[PDB]
Amino acid sequence: VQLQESGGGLVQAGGSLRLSCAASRSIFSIDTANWYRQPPGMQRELVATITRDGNANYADSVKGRFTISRDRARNTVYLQMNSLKPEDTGVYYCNAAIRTTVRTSAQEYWGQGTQVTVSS
Amino acid sequence: VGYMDPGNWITSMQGGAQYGYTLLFVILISSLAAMLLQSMTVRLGIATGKDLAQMTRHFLSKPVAIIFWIIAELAIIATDIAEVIGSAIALDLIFGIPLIVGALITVFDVFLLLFIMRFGFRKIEAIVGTLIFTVLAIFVFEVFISSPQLTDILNGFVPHKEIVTNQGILYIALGIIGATIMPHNLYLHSSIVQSRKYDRHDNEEKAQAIKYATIDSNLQLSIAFVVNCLLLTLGAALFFGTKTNDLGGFYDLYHALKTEPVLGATLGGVMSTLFAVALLASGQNSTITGTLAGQIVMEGFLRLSIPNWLRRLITRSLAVIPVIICLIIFKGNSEKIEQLLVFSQVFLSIALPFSLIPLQLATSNKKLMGPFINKTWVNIISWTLIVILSGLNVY
Ligand SMILES: [Mn+2]
Secondary structure (H helix, E strand, C coil): CCEEEECCEEEECCCCEEEEEEECCCCCEEEEEEEEEECCCCCCEEEEEECCCCCEEECCCCECCEEEEEECCCCEEEEEECCCCHHHCEEEEEEEEEECCCCCCCEEECCCCEEEEEEC | CCCCCHHHHHHHHHHHHCCCCCCHHHHHHHHHHHHHHHHHHHHHHHHCCCCHHHHHHCCCCHHHHHHHHHHHHHHHHHHHHHHHHHHHHHHHHHCCCCHHHHHHHCCCHHHHHHHHHCCCCCHHHHHHHHHHHHHHHHHHHCCCCCCCCCCCCCCCCCCCCCCCCCHHHHHHHHHHHHHHCCHHHHHHHHHHHHHCCCCCCCCCCCHHHHHHHHHHHHHHHHHHHHHHHHHHHHHHHHHCCCCCCCCCCHHHHHHHHHCCCCCCCHHHHHHHHHHHHHHHHHHHHHHHHHHHHHHHHHHHHCCCCCCHHHHHHHHHHHHHHHHHHHHHHCCCCHHHHHHHHHHHHHHHHHHCHHHHHHHHHHCCCCCCCCCCCHHHHHHHHHHHHHHHHHHHHCC
């Protein structure tokens, strides 16, 4: 089972994007999810974090603009990125605690980042 | 109308997924209470001239008759809310339509039932029948690690302490009973039973009509008991005794079926999909039976007459609003819209005393009425005791 990312790409400042975090095969539950990003020449930064109960929190640099959420029906964690700034450019990673079955212990998963480029 | 009810499923399944086989007594005692209370309405309808709604009106003045109508009408809306949520969830699992949009579609599902209308009124239910049976077959198959007596040790063999102590078990207990003893069925059954073949005015051999009607009322009520036990077993088997403590909603059941090891992946995906279609199917049947019941209540208490399609629209419009408001507040949280689902059945609990007491008074006056009102009075007092206890302990 591998964590797969999509929804990234190229967009103009002021535009919006929506990242998708799903697993390779059928999962019972994504109990927790984190959205990391890493701008060119900078450190890996935690951006969004959603919890089991549904509560979420965002970085001060992204709060009010970004929105992490869980699609329980498809076990997919989305990151709605609105009003994008040029400094939001970088590689976005998805960390999530996948639960293969109901009574299986929650394992930690990472994924190959996706490229997000906010131009001009 | 008892096993194709999303209110029954969500209460029984979360009653087992959270508290094991404890609430199996509550299923039994309420199913038994339902059998007895429905038989009183059957007698009330066939013996006396007309149904419960007008009977209640004949004893009350218009002000308190409207208050009774309000409580009754709200119970009808509460059931409709259960269907709205049930259909919205179904549309989310099958088509990926968000709950906030799905609830909006439920206004015009009324229009969708006319699309089903011209394709055979018998043709479609045969598909639904096989659908329900197949889904129920999965549920039966999805019962492993089953201790043949750990069920019994709490089934009927009441552990009457936690059921009433902590709010958690008590809350679901009220929802289970309110879903099995639906207040709108009392007003409905007290009029539809007067359509059977018997002499209206003079002949008392309409006790034969009561005979058939009571037997039929105990048949389908027994099946509802079996399914509710089968569903509580399902929730307990899958989600109870877990480290993560899953509440065991429709979404949990969906992924439990979809990720069941022995059931495979592609095969398990079919089972989960069939369940979702069955969840959708559970809706459109419930709205038709609920609409006829609304006519009786309104014409009984208010003596007001409007076409069914209109009241079907008004009732649905009023049912979607709290669903949408709930979805807006908690940002479309699926676990939260399921709490509204459970709460809709707990409200049916609150509305019950306002329907059981008039049923009692009529059953103790005019001929052909029951010998022991004892078994029926202890039900109401113990009922109002609990719904107020919960109504106060929370507040
Ligand atoms: Mn019910």
